[PDB]
Amino acid sequence: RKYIAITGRRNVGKSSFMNALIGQEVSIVKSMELSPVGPITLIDTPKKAKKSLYRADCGILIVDDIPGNFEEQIIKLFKELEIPYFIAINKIDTIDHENIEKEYKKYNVPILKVSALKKIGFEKIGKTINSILPKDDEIPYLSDLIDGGDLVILVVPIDLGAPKGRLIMPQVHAIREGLDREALVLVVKERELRYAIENIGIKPRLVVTDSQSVMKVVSDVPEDIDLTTFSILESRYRGDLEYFVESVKAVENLKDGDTVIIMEGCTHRPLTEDIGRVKIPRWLTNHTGAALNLKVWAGVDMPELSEIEDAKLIIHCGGCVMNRNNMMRRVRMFKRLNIPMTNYGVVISYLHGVLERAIKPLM
Amino acid sequence: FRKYIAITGRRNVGKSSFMNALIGQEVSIVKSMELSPVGPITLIDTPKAKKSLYRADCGILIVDDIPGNFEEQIIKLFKELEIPYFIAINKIDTIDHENIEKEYKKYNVPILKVSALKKIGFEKIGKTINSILPKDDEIPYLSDLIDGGDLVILVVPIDLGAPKGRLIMPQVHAIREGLDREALVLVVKERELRYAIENIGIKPRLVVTDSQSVMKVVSDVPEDIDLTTFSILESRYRGDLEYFVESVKAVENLKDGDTVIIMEGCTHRPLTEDIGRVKIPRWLTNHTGAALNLKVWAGVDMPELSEIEDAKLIIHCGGCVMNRNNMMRRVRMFKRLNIPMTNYGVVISYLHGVLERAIKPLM
Ligand code: SF4
Ligand code: SF4
Structure with a gap:
């Protein structure tokens, strides 16, 4: 509503x-x-x-x-x-x-x-x-963003993906948008990236990698070539990358009592999705050394002021099922309240120390 | 089916x-x-x-x-x-x-x-x-055609495809199988093929093109590089490419009275599918100069002997909705009766004069 x-x-x-x-x-x-x-x-x-x-x-x-x-x-x-x-x-x-x-x-x-x-x-x-x-x-x-005609875009997926003869939607979308801009799309598994870069004979305009193969590939990609992740591309696509990147700096200022809300964009989260509920809270505690008050919020609409009021940071999911409107409605709400709001994608990239590189072609 | x-x-x-x-x-x-x-x-x-x-x-x-x-x-x-x-x-x-x-x-x-x-x-x-x-x-x-590990496969689609942010299934399948063999998959529109070949600096193991961009791209691809179409790949995948290729030679021997049966593997063909019902019959008549007795057989299960008996050639659809078994049953039935059976894909490639090239990496 x-x-x-x-x-x-x-x-x-x-x-x-x-x-x-x-x-x-x-x-x-x-x-x-x-x-x-x-x-x-x-x-x-x-x-x-x-x-x-x-x-x-x-x-x-x-x-x-x-x-x-x-x-x-x-x-x-x-x-x-x-x-x-x-x-x-x-x-x-x-x-x-x-x-x-x-x-x-x-x-x-x-x-x-x-x-x-x-x-x-x-x-x-x-x-x-x-x-x-x-x-x-x-x-x-x-597309219209980071691409042009005749550019080489290297899309780097993992050793394991989706069902037989099929590809995950962020991969199909990235290929389609590349072809839309008349760029040459080179799809490659992480094991072939070093070989591709060294022999392809065209300088890649952009290299897009999966967030789970990023720490390995950052080494393989020369510093002069733009490199991002699908998580960071998604973040900008349906959320506010500038606000998510500025808000992640709040992690450094997290105290023992401080409240952190793991916010979900749906009530149909798979049990296999422990990245925000289990993994990120443990990484945040190890990084800060703070015994944080980790809370989880899940719903399709807007939270009531009482449910979010004294949160020091909001860590929102990627929003796979959410549209830009619903995600932006939450961003503008936290901007109004002056409560930092970040992403799983921006948090992962930050703690792995690949954020600065991954956002460089977008900011 | 029984x-x-x-x-x-x-x-x-x-x-x-x-x-x-x-x-x-x-x-x-x-x-x-x-x-x-x-x-x-x-x-x-x-x-x-x-x-x-x-x-x-x-x-x-x-x-x-x-x-x-x-x-x-x-x-x-x-x-x-x-x-x-x-x-x-x-x-x-x-x-x-x-x-x-x-x-x-x-x-x-x-x-x-x-x-x-x-x-x-x-x-x-x-x-x-x-x-x-x-x-x-x-x-x-x-997957069997590209022993990968390092091989460049160029998948060449048309200027127009499927809905926004998406790709047609034969394209997604061809990319997935390429990645399965740890190959380097280069997806490119027909307008970028000449530029890709000339600047990519790696010799393609195989070039797979759409059957509607084949006559243009045959010129762009050097003679020493293997080139096939998705139509020919589908033909081998669910049918018998050797029998379809041998049976297409029957087109040359077609007389005025001769019966040709356009055979479909489903009772729900889209109205936009005029390739076998309208296009191929007109091309066959122009090529042969014969006032052929064009008939259409559509269904699931094996045709009765009376429905196929004196057919001089069967032109079966690509069978998008059929499995290998149902198609192979139809292949064995026509082999037993000694009635030539071909494909839409093999017929298109034949009449356009690209069949010999398109089957070279497969036969
Ligand atoms: S990422 Fe998708 S499935 Fe997971 S909580 Fe967010 S909307 Fe739900
Ligand atoms: S190609 Fe597919 S839709 Fe067309 S007749 Fe054959 S099974 Fe039916």
């Missing part, structure tokens, strides 16, 4: 607006179903307003007068917190088409005219929310 | 009683029958036996006396027609354990003892049939 922030002065009548908007509920048998957007949750916002706006996907600023110290203040807050918004002129039965043009046009945001008492204009909110809601459109995995 | 069992024996042996007693073994929960461990089976009574034995998967020779001119003749026929068999001694209530050791051991085939009248030994036929039935196990797609 999407989280809508409801902002306005005490006099504007937020209660009447929220009740009239709930009258738009379109469910078949303050949360509700509002078309064309799916399920939504209205957040009433009664000095860090950061504690309420932390998981807001978009906001509504309800006005009935000329922009003042309140309007200017919450607009600056929406901009700072990366929250899209629109202005809803309430009580149009008293002031009407006065503030629509003469003011508020300068904010370059949608302006709607409503009357909660007269029951007018609430059938236009759903479409307006849908238009401002952050759609986190797919960004290239390695 | 298995066909040939029932052979002299007029004096009880073929009728044997067949009726064996049908007594029917194990269906709801002359054809369900015989465990094998699935559905069809018994063929054999009163040029080639016309009855044409689709026989295996055979049973029913005896009650010392091997004669009939036994020796039928055994030679099973060997010539590539039909596995076993001996069944009927009327054991009269002769018993006499012919089991003293004779028939020389044929090195399973020998069973039965009595159709006394109802004894028929519960052992199912397991015996199952043991002699041709399995037709998976043969390598290209």
Whole structure:
């Protein structure tokens, strides 16, 4: 579900607006179903307003007068917190088409005219929310980004992969994107990389390796050739690599009592996935020498403030099943709360001492 | 799909009683029958036996006396027609354990003892049939062609393929098998092949191309380098490349009245598959100058003799949905009838004048 922030002065009548908007509920048998957007949750916002706006996907600023110290203040807050918004002129039965043009046009945001008492204009909110809601459109995995025509890309997988005659999706995607850019894609097992580099006669533009063959291959790849991992490529692809890389530095500042949350992007994690639940916590404890308060969070939606509040670092999974939107919604939430958020991929690369090299072609 | 069992024996042996007693073994929960461990089976009574034995998967020779001119003749026929068999001694209530050791051991085939009248030994036929039935196990797609360890394999796909971030299965399979043999797999679009060959600095062991980019790439690939197509690789993989290549020569001898059967290995071909139904017939008519009697056979299971009898050539599909066994059964049936059988892949390569080159690394 999407989280809508409801902002306005005490006099504007937020209660009447929220009740009239709930009258738009379109469910078949303050949360509700509002078309064309799916399920939504209205957040009433009664000095860090950061504690309420932390998981807001978009906001509504309800006005009935000329922009003042309140309007200017919450607009600056929406901009700072990366929250899209629109202005809803309430009580149009008293002031009407006065503030629509003469003011508020300068904010370059949608302006709607409503009357909660007269029951007018609430059938236009759903479409307006849908238009401002952050759609986190797919960004290239390695294509338009790091490739060009005639370049050699070396994709280095492990000695063991997926079922007979098949390949894992990050490998297929990396090959497809390379061919899309008309680059030559050289797929090679870790044992053939040294031979390939030394005899291929074309300088590789990029070498992409599996995170489990990285420590071996870093040695085989000359320093002048760009090298990354599929874990780092995934990190950038669906998350925020810059934030994940900056947030991993928090590992150094971890104290004994400090809370670390292993955050999962799904409720269907395989029992064979012990990298975040078992492996990373043990590596973190050995590296820091801190008896950390390791906690695990797993769900499809957004955590409540109480579940994440005093976390010193969030270590989110790769997000194999998650889209960019859902991953970015979590990133913006931790950015708003100023809580460091990293990846399994960024943590692995950091502790192995290959992060600086792996991010060099991307940053 | 069901298995066909040939029932052979002299007029004096009880073929009728044997067949009726064996049908007594029917194990269906709801002359054809369900015989465990094998699935559905069809018994063929054999009163040029080639016309009855044409689709026989295996055979049973029913005896009650010392091997004669009939036994020796039928055994030679099973060997010539590539039909596995076993001996069944009927009327054991009269002769018993006499012919089991003293004779028939020389044929090195399973020998069973039965009595159709006394109802004894028929519960052992199912397991015996199952043991002699041709399995037709998976043969390598290209792994056997690239002794790898260091060999460069160039996989050349087209400018257009499958959906975004994905690749078609013959491409993924060819890459997987290359990595299985620890080869260096270079995936490249047809526009980059000339550039790859000239700058890659390693001599390719094999170049595999799409059948739609073959006429262009034959020019780009030096004569000393082995080159094949995915169509030719599929032909060998699930069919008989030697028979398909020998049988394509029949195209030259095609007369005006001559019957050509376009044979499909599934009843659900996509409407976008006009290569065998529309394209090949038009190419065949232009090439030969013959007003051929083009017919289409589609299904799973063996065709009846009347449906294929006077066909001068069979042009079978690639069989994407079929297994090696079902295709090989069709190959053996046409070999027995001495009817030429070819592929869409072998026909395309032949008419485009690239067959000799494409089969050179395989034959
Ligand atoms: S990596 Fe995939 S399977 Fe594992 S917890 Fe994250 S979303 Fe679930
Ligand atoms: S190639 Fe595949 S889809 Fe086409 S007729 Fe043969 S089995 Fe059916």
